[PDB]
Write a protein that binds this ligand. Structure first.
Ligand SMILES: NC(=O)c1ccc[n+]([C@@H]2O[C@H](COP(=O)([O-])OP(=O)(O)OC[C@H]3O[C@@H](n4cnc5c(N)ncnc54)[C@H](OP(=O)(O)O)[C@@H]3O)[C@@H](O)[C@H]2O)c1
Ligand SMILES: O=[N+]([O-])c1ccc(O)c(CN2CCN(c3cccc(C(F)(F)F)c3)CC2)c1
Length: 314
């Protein structure tokens, strides 16, 4: 089922992850998203960065056209990339994203990250050092507010913000709309409980990404770090409930009132992940998973760690 946003709109509590790396043909994005919708998914998460909006838009419009689903049955998220943080660029980037997906509006538009870059998805100096930018994100937000006001996005939110960055938006002068959510890295090795409480107290949904340990992408993730789905507690619980570690991890998020994203480009696992609605972890199960937290984020950059808006300390 869904959950009510601080704006009145509803968000399905399970969402499909759509990112896949360059080497996965863009055609593939259209298939998987369709299987996702057929399987039961009603929340779809894309981004400009992901470069798959044409197919994801099509996927959706394809399932409206086969009578599977109405449009308001579907919750579609896109995201503003960091080269577009300047307010005069927010709306054009949203419009672009809509035009690509042949769609009238997105349910949710996010600030992908607070790490502003220079107005190239990854702009780079003479040496290959990525070029930072410093923008007042409150002006980015006022621009996001004009997009909601204009019906182009039903709900607005942020992604990758920490507590301090969220407070910055929440105490902006003349604030019109709270962010409805804050999409963040969240899984049992990095549960973000403190930030989860804060978000809750501000009537902000925490949406978990990489809740399955991520795609372990070579650009971002240290190959040393342990594979989430291989954890013995997550594996013990899978047997215990006759399910898979993935399913344990997803259901874990639901029972803390966290909306959870799951990515798969495999038809079996796409169908599997909706079994998350078929079973319950116990109170003991939950405290056991709570114990797994070890302050480990899969995404890393020595480059970005020195960006003035880097969200994690350390
Ligand atoms: N806001 C951001 O900055 C941000 C960052 C990262 C991600 N996201 C969102 O998060 C979404 C997903 O997160 P993620 O892409 O990092 O991946 P993820 O959800 O952690 O999943 C990672 C891997 O788990 C595997 N997997 C999925 N279901 C499984 C199952 N039932 N059993 C076993 N393995 C399974 C998948 O492989 P297969 O594909 O082989 O099934 C996938 O590669 C992304 O699509 C994106 O929408 C947002
Ligand atoms: O699978 N994927 O490769 C993949 C899939 C979906 C995505 O939205 C992205 C893009 N990410 C890049 C990392 N980023 C981030 C956020 C915080 C810290 C750090 C730091 F620790 F690295 F600095 C990085 C969030 C946005 C990559």
């Amino acid at each position: 089922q869904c959950v009510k946003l601080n704006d009145g709109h509803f968000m399905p509590v399970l969402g499909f992850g759509t990112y896949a790396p360059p080497e996965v043909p863009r055609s593939k994005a259209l298939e998987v998203t369709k299987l996702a919708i057929e399987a039961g998914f009603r929340h779809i998460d894309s981004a400009h960065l992901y470069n798959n909006e044409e197919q994801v838009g099509l996927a959706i419009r394809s399932k409206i056209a086969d009578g599977s689903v109405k449009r308001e049955d579907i919750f579609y998220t896109s995201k503003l990339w960091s080269t577009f943080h300047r307010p005069e660029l927010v709306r054009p980037a949203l419009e672009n994203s809509l035009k690509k997906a042949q769609l009238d509006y997105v349910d949710l538009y996010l600030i992908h990250s607070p790490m502003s870059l220079k107005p190239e998805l990854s702009p780079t100096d003479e040496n290959g050092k990525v070029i930072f930018d410093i923008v007042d994100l409150c002006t980015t937000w006022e621009a996001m507010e004009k997009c909601k006001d204009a019906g182009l996005a039903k709900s607005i939110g942020v992604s990758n913000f920490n507590r301090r960055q969220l407070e910055m938006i929440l105490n902006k002068p003349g604030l019109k709309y709270k962010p409805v959510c804050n999409q963040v890295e969240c899984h049992p090795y990095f549960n973000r409980s403190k930030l989860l409480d804060f978000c809750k107290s501000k009537d902000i949904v925490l949406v978990a990404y990489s809740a399955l340990g991520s795609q372990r992408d070579k650009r971002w993730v240290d190959p040393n770090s342990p594979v989430l789905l291989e954890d013995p507690v997550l594996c013990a619980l899978a047997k215990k409930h006759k399910r898979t570690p993935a399913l344990i991890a997803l259901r874990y998020q639901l029972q803390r009132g966290v909306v959870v994203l799951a990515k798969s480009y495999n038809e079996q696992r796409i169908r599997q992940n909706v079994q998350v609605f078929e079973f319950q972890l116990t109170a003991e199960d939950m405290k056991a998973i709570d114990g797994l937290d070890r302050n480990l984020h899969y995404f890393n950059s020595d480059s970005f760690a020195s960006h003035p808006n880097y969200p994690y300390s350390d």
